[PDB]
Design a protein around this ligand. Structure first.
Ligand SMILES: Nc1nc2c(ncn2[C@@H]2O[C@H](COP(=O)(O)OP(=O)(O)OP(=O)(O)O)[C@@H](O)[C@H]2O)c(=O)[nH]1
Ligand SMILES: Nc1nc2c(ncn2[C@@H]2O[C@H](COP(=O)(O)OP(=O)(O)OP(=O)(O)O)[C@@H](O)[C@H]2O)c(=O)[nH]1
Lengths: 360, 360
């Protein structure tokens, strides 16, 4: 049993992180999201995964070929020149998914959740048709495409792409299991699967919907990165509570790498990830922020709801609030205020940014 | 006699273009800026030109070994692991510029002008001292650092970085002729030369200043890129008037590459440089704009004062004004309006941008 991962290129959202390394290679709770997905996928028992990339990503082939030898499952490498979309990647890796008539996982990279792989296999064997789709609950139907499910069967009736009508609560979760006949329906042109291929299958009624328990987040956006951060630390607190670092100046769910250093007399608040090799100085308050690797946060700073990129240097007495994202190698001078500043990589900030704008 | 070229790392202005190719590799009037500078340096008779990179730029390595076998002059590549700034590159390549006791050029890449190399050599031999600076006029002194000039000697009494006192009209033009004893003064720490080293040479009175006639531009900025493109097409009109393409639907000084295609019944206005392989369709008005290579502009569009990146697709009835820089592979949909839209690469725009803002 095989599994395709969609990890083509350039996540548009969260652009200051995607400009430096690819979107599946950014560090989500001190680990890339692709390592989370292939880690759970080898926990499922999938033999070999296949990864479909349009962007040339030599650092990603380096990481995945080290990870292929690290974990014990093989990794084949679907390579594309022109952006092939989301359906086209199944049709390039076509003959290999045609080699065995057995249902295969199809996964989006930007979703982090608690993966029910074998329960989804068991649902797909229990319903016995072509495609199985994973759906979740949200609180805001006016953002994502709603799907309507029948009770006790989970069959699709209609796939609706726009909101504001309220025919259904449930939302695409980005996990599919597909049969090879679905792949026979997919052509090599760059078209999207969820835009047309899932719509005719829903018009045939071929898809069925399986529901999750909870803890789902697409983290393709930076505010969605921070909410999925918050929910992943809550799920780690409730599954492996010895892995979060606890202490006297530590509040809530805090996960700290062993390479990370935390200074004397500072209160690190709830729902934070500190990357490997970060240096926190004295008097620094960190709440709901994600600090990626080798980023030094100097003394007496205050930081709320932010993404500090790799090898940054925020000075002393900087205030940082409202989901500002720093790119790689961003130096922030002393005594500055950042609110909504999406700062591009290799920038030096000496102004305060009172209002949300992009610094380049 | 040789020349050092500051070439290295991530020009933060002109960023929509900098994120795809390096800053000396962007095409300025159907030619990269570095090919302009090395082309003029080989017209001067410089033996070998050394360029100092800190950003890993393998494509620059690639076009520079192609240009090494093109122009007949050797190219040496000083490599820096972390940023050494603009004085550090003098110190890293310092044993090569210490091999011969000649005065050497050191150049900024973002300056495009009519290069008076041998006149600067004659001026440096006449004044007979340590360092010679090129200076030029400006219309607003409140933007750039001013430098005072004595008549009939050209010596620099004082170097002022900050404006708004009006002691001098003249501005640094980005070309220096330096002795080996300047590079014995120079140090291996990432300091910049125009911060500290030129100020203590001006403090010793050791600097002298040579004045340009006209046609100077620093094109590190996109509006400055368009103004320098206007000035370069004016100087190209007065020097090689048979190289600019003339026609019935062509107004002003227009440079068209031989691979570029221009459709019927369209009005290409003044100061327009079309790159190699661009496709201008039927009824497109383009004034004051720079269209880089492989970019298609579909029918009935209107473009004024804009930089169209590589492999773009501007749709039909699109209006673009106010220095809207499109990055690489930007698909603008039909019937849109862009005013100041500084669009990042690999974007698709479906909305009008009425005010100047950054689209990521
Ligand atoms: N390999 C390949 N992967 C692609 C291509 N287009 C999209 N993908 C992947 O498709 C998956 C899901 O698509 P999206 O949720 O829209 O993510 P995205 O393509 O990164 O776009 P944004 O997140 O909005 O910036 C992502 O993991 C992408 O990496 C492609 O052309 N080639
Ligand atoms: N090779 C090397 N080159 C550098 C470095 N820093 C600056 N340079 C070069 O110094 C030259 C002049 O500096 P600037 O005019 O400020 O240009 P810039 O470094 O591109 O910065 P911006 O144009 O404002 O984005 C440019 O051609 C840069 O390529 C460096 O750290 N390593």
């Amino acid at each position: 049993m095989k599994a395709l991962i969609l990890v083509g290129g350039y996540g548009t959202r969260l652009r200051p992180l995607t400009l430096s390394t690819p979107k599946p290679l950014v560090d989500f709770c001190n680990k890339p999201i692709l390592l989370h997905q292939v880690e759970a996928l080898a926990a499922a028992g999938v033999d070999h995964v296949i990864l479909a990339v349009s962007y040339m990503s030599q650092v990603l082939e380096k990481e995945m070929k080290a990870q292929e030898q690290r974990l014990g499952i093989r990794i084949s490498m679907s390579h594309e020149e022109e952006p092939l979309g989301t359906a086209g990647p199944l049709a390039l890796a076509r003959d290999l998914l045609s080699e065995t008539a057995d249902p295969f996982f199809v996964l989006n990279s930007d979703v982090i959740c608690d993966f029910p792989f074998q329960a989804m296999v068991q649902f797909h064997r229990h319903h016995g048709q072509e495609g199985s789709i994973l759906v979740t609950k949200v609180e805001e139907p006016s953002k994502y495409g709603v799907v309507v499910c029948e009770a006790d069967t989970g069959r699709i009736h209609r796939f609706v792409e726009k909101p504001q009508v309220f025919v259904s609560n449930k939302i695409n979760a980005g996990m599919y299991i597909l049969s090879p006949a679905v792949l026979q329906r997919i052509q090599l042109q760059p078209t999207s699967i969820e835009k047309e291929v899932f719509p005719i299958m829903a018009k045939e009624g071929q898809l069925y919907a399986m529901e999750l328990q909870g803890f789902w987040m697409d983290i393709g956006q930076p505010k969605d990165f921070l909410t999925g951060m918050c929910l992943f630390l809550q799920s780690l607190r409730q599954k492996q509570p010895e892995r979060l670092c606890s202490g006297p100046g530590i509040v809530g769910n805090v996960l700290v790498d062993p390479s990370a250093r935390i200074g004397q007399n500072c209160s690190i608040g709830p729902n934070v990830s500190l990357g490997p090799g970060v240096v926190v100085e004295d008097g620094v308050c960190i709440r709901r922020c994600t600090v990626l690797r080798d980023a030094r946060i100097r003394s007496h700073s205050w930081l709320e709801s932010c993404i500090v990129g790799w090898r940054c240097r925020v000075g002393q007495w900087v205030r940082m609030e409202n989901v500002t994202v720093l790119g790689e190698d961003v130096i922030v001078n002393d005594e500055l205020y950042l609110n909504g500043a999406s700062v591009l990589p290799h920038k030096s900030i000496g102004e305060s940014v009172p209002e949300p704008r992009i610094i380049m």
